[PDB]
Amino acid sequence: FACKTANGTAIPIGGGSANVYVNLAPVVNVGQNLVVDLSTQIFCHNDYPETITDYVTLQRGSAYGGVLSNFSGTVKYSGSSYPFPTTSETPRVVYNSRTDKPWPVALYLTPVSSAGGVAIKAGSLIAVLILRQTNNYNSDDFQFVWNIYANNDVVVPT
Ligand SMILES: OC[C@H]1O[C@H](Oc2ccc(-c3ccccc3)cc2)[C@@H](O)[C@@H](O)[C@@H]1O
């Protein structure tokens, strides 16, 4: 099992970490949702689908900076919703193909009532997503860290 970003930065067999830089809605109103969709940025595949089932959770979705102080957050994993920042590991998803498949992860962040001005600072770290990979074959328990970085400021109209 391995993953890669849309720009081609890879995290090989065994885990590791990568930086993902995402473009955001530049202007977001209170009562409106800012969508960070990593299913366009993060892909993974199973190296031996003939024999092995890879199982993939979001183990932890952690929040920093302006995403942590100005937004209320939900995280959609493979079709179900959860709090973001997360409260427990999600259910396991199966990668059974060598073709690279999206990691089905999307942040849905809503500005808090007191939000206003520059809610997210360009180039800050807005989130750390922990991908957890196991299988049905050995005792492999591997961690693919995604450090999510803002490509641009986000303003909440005042
Ligand atoms: O995606 C599946 C796995 O691929 C990696 O591990 C192995 C371990 C063993 C074999 C193998 C076994 C017998 C003959 C030829 C190859 C192939 C891959 C490893 O990434 C792991 O976590 C992941 O479950």
Numbering used by the authors: 1 to 158
Manuscript text:
E. coli clinical isolates express the FimH adhesin, which consists of a mannose-specific lectin domain connected via a pilin domain to the tip of type 1 pili. The FimH lectin binds specifically to mannose moieties displayed on glycoproteins at the luminal surface of epithelial cells. Mannose binds in a deep and polar pocket at the N-terminal end of FimH, in which the amino acids Phe1, Asn46, Asp47, Asp54, Gln133, Asn135, Asp140 and Phe142 create a dense network of 12 hydrogen bonds with each hydroxyl group of the pyran­ose ring except that at the α-anomeric position of mannose. The interaction of the aglycones with the tyrosine gate formed by two tyrosines (Tyr48 and Tyr137) at the entrance to the FimH binding site contributes significantly to their affinity, for example with a 400-fold increase for HM compared with α-d-manno­pyranoside.
In this study, novel crystal structures of tyrosine-gate mutants of FimH, ligand-free or in complex with heptyl α-d-O-mannopyranoside or 4-biphenyl α-d-O-mannopyranoside, are combined with quantum-mechanical calculations and molecular-dynamics simulations. As no crystal structures carrying either the Y48A or Y137A mutation were available for BF, we generated all MD simulations from the WT structures after introducing the mutation in silico (see §2.11). The lack of the Tyr137 side chain can thus not be compensated for, probably because of its larger distance from the mannose. The steric hindrance by Tyr48 renders the binding highly dynamic, whereby the aromatic ligand seeks multiple stacking modes predominantly with the two tyrosines, thus including Tyr137. In contrast to HM, the flexibility of BF is almost not restricted in the WT binding site and also not in the Y137A mutant.
